[model samples]
Target: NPFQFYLTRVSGVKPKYNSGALHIKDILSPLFGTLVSSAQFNYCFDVDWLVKQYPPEFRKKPILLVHGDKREAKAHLHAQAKPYENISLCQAKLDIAFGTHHTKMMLLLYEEGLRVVIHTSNLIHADWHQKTQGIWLSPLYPRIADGTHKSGESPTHFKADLISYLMAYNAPSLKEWIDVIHKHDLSETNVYLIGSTPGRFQGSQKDNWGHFRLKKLLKDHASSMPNAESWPVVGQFSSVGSLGADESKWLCSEFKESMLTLGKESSSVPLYLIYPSVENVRTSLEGYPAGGSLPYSIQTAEKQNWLHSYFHKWSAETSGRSNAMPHIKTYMRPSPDFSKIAWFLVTSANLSKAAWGALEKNGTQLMIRSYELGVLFLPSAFGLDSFKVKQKFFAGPMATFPVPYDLPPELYGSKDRPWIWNIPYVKAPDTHGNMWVP
Candidate 1:
């Protein structure tokens, strides 16, 4: 069990505030030594400000920018990138209505090897500065001998699934990336691949692949589950989009039945939505305006009473690092004792129906309309089969299993309530100079 992992519990990294803590930049700073340049695939970004931090040698190389916005609105980004040598600007494929290229990934091709980073954060300053984000770092895969394996070959289904996702783009600009991935050897990688594609995806395209696939994915991986009513499941994210006016059709229903096997007479799992309040933002090191990027809606609160029982407060101080707010989206099923988690997911997917496909009328297919993706980690992935066994206590060999948040979820108190993302009433603009719309 070579558990040489790359999970981060971000704490005390700010040099201004403290030393000897992990900074978001510190994760990649080490890899940049052999780095030629970087490719940024994000929904939105600050290319100029980001690239400026790179070394002079790396800065000279072209920085590839792939985003989901129109070319006209990105003129400012282009203007800043013009001075650089042959920077590549690609407008991501957007035929899928209301879908944005929301995957946060970076392909760092270095002199010796290439490092793939799938993380949670818009490639913006505020997201990295004061927000808590998650990072999944791939072991450095040095360029392997050409023709060692067939192109598009992978050791596990994960790599193949990733290739399928890349091919889904069908964008000419991404052809080079596809080619690069084909040449790499991913046999040693262990990350699980969970992705959502646009259009009606019916019946495990390849054994539970595509949108709303988490349910099937878990069924295959986990050996046991709790037999109880309303099991505790936590949902945390920086953004929350509308799931329509009907509470039954709300995103909560998706979590209750789809994500969690709640409808079954044997078990029921209720979702606890963890989001920051206005006061949490106001009290942050950067102040309310600084932490205000986390989005939800007043309209949503008005439409559904779902928050009354399950909403939880987002405590920034619990990370043992002050000032940082959460940009990380995590899902976890805690044990009855609240000491261990049954399973966990760290992903770019939000609470929007767009991220998790809706159930069809027949309940046989998932009609997904967005390109959302993430990875799931079971205790088995870390060699702890006992952790998934419901009756048994959670004592495992992998002592440092990744824990996304503090133990025993902090329930919202009367004084501190869940933040209603009221954008219309918010006076200050976000770091991007516009209202942070969900």
Candidate 2:
């Protein structure tokens, strides 16, 4: 299990990875029998669904659940979790009207190591069953005092940043886990953590979360790659947010600016957005139902119709996920030919102000409403000069990065429109001969 981009397993398709691509089981099975504690974070959950994935003894291990749904928090006793006397529930605070606790991450503390996972899918049957979600798994970090472990293994701020993100929760339950993190050696961590916490942040605090955090990380670490100016910055996501009065106001301005900043001193870069079109969703493996996870609204699109200029149909023919319908959100600056990449990211954050953070009050404060998390892959982390896509015979021994979607993504046709889940599409039936009736 190498560290790189991985697509979660689909119900019917065989996976490309050794044990299947980031299956729920791969992360939860606890085959090593050394897992002593765990933490699960997500917007939704089915404790019963997760318990079945774990070993029987895992039920007795200390489990900390940070969820957004108040219903589960009200009882503080999820059906399956009820059986686990060691389980602790912490409901994430949602003070913003339109916000939600949407981050998907996990912390596993083994008797001898720790494992970190950041992914897009929720802990539910449907999410893991058919959708194409992104997943990133860290190498098992050994205890800092292990004889074979070295102090400088993790050169990035991954450990410190994670501890910082956890502290923001102000949860006493997580304090011990933070202590556990302090004992482990995450020296093999090659990715950087970019997390967004809910708040209206100002001063030095602004760069600790959201896109500003990413902006700072990239500014300091991203180098100017060959032909970077020609590389296009692409954004692929499950949903679209209210992008403001016009595309230029937000989507094309700050958001695009942040992406283009990949090459420290960058020139204008091309921007492309990959979203499923009405036809793309209608013909998907799950048909019209897949759009349920893709929550773009007609009203939002109508107001920012200009988004059509940069829209590309969601297609993952290369990874055999074209029909699965993408719920995974990624942003990257790929070479024009898609052979090399400057950087890449897989996140729970969508194309939204709430997820990415919106600059407010004359740019003095950053306002974010949702909790989001993601990992960024910088080329230097792997001792590589650049991120090269795997090419059969030519990939060589170097760690090759996987591009999740087709290169030069297909653009929308004149008649095509971005899929708005709330809108009815009776003109054309779906794969199941069913019309989408919102």
Candidate 3:
């Protein structure tokens, strides 16, 4: 009755909350409830911890192929799901199938959510076959082998021993990635390539409380199939990126002058502020460097990270004081000349957040959002160079110390106001700047 009552007026009004109880007095409560209650659903912050703990092969299977318009994404998923027609699209909606509309459509065509019959990943889940740390690929071998040269019948030695090589690291769960390929409209979808959390941030340690039941499940799964494992995943989170707390604060505060600071630190060196938090985005960065010593001219000037700041999230998950992750999502080469830094992985999980939660820590979340993804794409020679040209002026031609600040007009007087204008500070005043994007 409640479901029907609320469903009837689902589109009428937005829902509200009073304490633990949702003010279901609103008509649209049913729809809101439905969206939040799916079994496949999860809060990404904690989930990322688990994702990082799995083997790289287990974690990196699902790749964000390409992000574009929603219509384009739908077409791509439809095409990809077509090839797996005969294969039972799924077993149960357990760890996979969160946001996959396209994959669901494909399953409907096949048989509509068949139970552990076949084609499901034998290694990842618990079923008739063995368990897994990661899925391992090997050359096909027959059940029984030919007689050996010992002149006598051999015992039970199979044709070949299953050996594994890390083909693709940081892969996503195949089933999940396929779901993304199927459901999302890439054009509108800000697709983020999923990846593993760093090694230090992984595993169940005595002091670590971020490790949850789901993490244990993945751990058990991987341990059960070590030989069958593909690549060892890295984090203990459901996700990993610079879109968490530590990185969020740094983006708005310390890194606020990253361009100026990094620009001055090393000219010949290639610099990349990888996986920047929400503040790094342009629209939100309207009135930047409002009170800093840097001249208004230099303060307001848009830098490389400015244009892409919107791509990051700064609400609860990313920007905060305590309950955030620590660790820079940047990739910098040591030499003044950019070279040798082949690849890098960075995020905002922060030192505190990812470090431990069971220890009774708190994080901030204002008009915040927990970002689903972060990415850093670059070339070998230039590293993050050629990515942003004006950046050359910001940092290059500098000695060990930072160049003098030349305030820009946008910093002191920009017509465009930022979104965080009126919202009260949820954490500390520093968490959200009072001045413009400063």
Candidate 4:
């Protein structure tokens, strides 16, 4: 069933060994017996232990909007959730300049309704412990007494791009969840809200935000497939921005021609970059504290030593999660014989021009600093499912779109190197003997 994308269960593994993935208490699973009412928001980029992982009597009230520096993140969410004084915290504004609301959204409310979760760690608790994250979760969205619940007519305008990414957080604590996400029924989402909200846009108002908003959704859903230019354009991340000093001067040219699903022959393809080598995080599963949320530095890999020849280490072993350590940020294209896949993304973007952007002045402004959010699947929307847009490639005989790392990817040797999380380790120690100072 080619799970479009879902893999998070990895806190010392085994839930039938990451079965179908996802679990941070399965996105606050409730509404079982007493059919709970809706309303519960969660915005991320670290929110300590996340409302104590909710759901005890269905979570006691909280709607948070976080991010660093909004005057010390409201006193760091009041130094560890101020003894739940009926907990409520707001503040997701800090007007860019090395931005950081680092979006990880989760508006979850339920009785089988309005459950949207675009993920990638850092709601802390060692960020779902031992790294490797990513979650999708949508398809609850009810509450339709038919007014055609139109968020400007959807067809993956995903209810007008999720209430324009919650009205670009021009707050009043998010217009009461943007009026309950425009009265629900989000037309059973098909996925395509590239969202990046920060700013300095331009003409066509920068066509939907960041990476020219996934270069206009890969020039209209993966630039006409079939040999989509030898399909292959990976990006798996966990931090490593400052994509300058060449790679055709902007991550292999305009962020690889805006994630080329093949426009301009997808820059004749080749961007593979799965990253994670410092002995793949000193033999991971949790060694060297899973490289403390992978920040990739050594002065940004010594200013991109040509991005270590387009790296590719972070294996996946058919979802055993290759010793687990990837704060998940995917991007795909597949099918150069990876058996079909021409679209897939799940972001909290990394490998930054301040988290996916940079088309400054000459290209007539497109700046972006960070507030990224991601979702863009398109295996022709999805299979035998009746969202009615099929061209085929959600076909994974397991190797089609279940790609959670592991494929033809294995490069990075010639003495490996790319895991510079603040250097100096002289080997030995880690597996807990630890030696990753800072």
lDDT of every predicted structure (CA atoms): 0.62, 0.81, 0.20, 0.70
Per residue, candidate 2 scores C-alpha lDDT tens digits across 1-438 of 245567787766544422346678777775643778889998877877876777776767887888776664557546657776787887777777788889899898887688888999988888987788988888888787645544434777789888888887787877888888888888778899999988899999998888888888878888766566788988999898988877667777787777777546734678889999988899988899999999998888888877778899987766677788899999988888878888889999999999999989998999999999999988877777677775531123446777777888888999998889998989988888899887
Compose the digit string of candidate 4's lDDT tens values, residues 124-166: 6766766778878776667766555344345767887778777
Angstrom error at residue 59, model 1: 1.2
Ranking of all predicted structures according to lDDT, beginning with the best and ending with the worst: 2, 4, 1, 3
Q: After TM-score superposition, what is the CA distance of residue 36 in candidate 4 from its true location, in Å?
A: 2.3
lDDT of 3 by residue, 1-438 (tens): 000100011111222211111111221122222111011111111223323323433343321221111356445534543442322122112122122111100011111111100011111111111110011111111112234222111111111100000011122433443332233222211111222221222233321112221232223211221121221111211122232333334333322222122111122212222221223222122212212211212222232224233232222110111112111122212222221222221222221223212212222111111111122222221222222211211122111211011101012113322222222223223323543443
The per-prediction CA RMSD against the true structure, in angstroms, equals 5.1, 2.9, 21.8, 20.5
Better of 2 and 3 by lDDT: 2
Can you give the TM-score per candidate against the true fold? 0.83, 0.92, 0.21, 0.34
Runs of candidate 2 with Cα error greater than 4 angstroms are 14-20, 71-84, 146-153, 225-227, 263-268, 391-396
Q: How accurate is candidate 2 locally (lDDT)?
A: 0.81
Model 1 CA deviation exceeding 4 Å by range: 1-24, 30-33, 150-156, 204-211, 226-231, 250-252, 261-267, 316-318, 386-398, 423-438
Model 3 deviation from native, Cα RMSD in Å: 21.8
Index of the highest-lDDT prediction: 2
Evaluated against the true structure, the overall lDDT of model 1 is 0.62
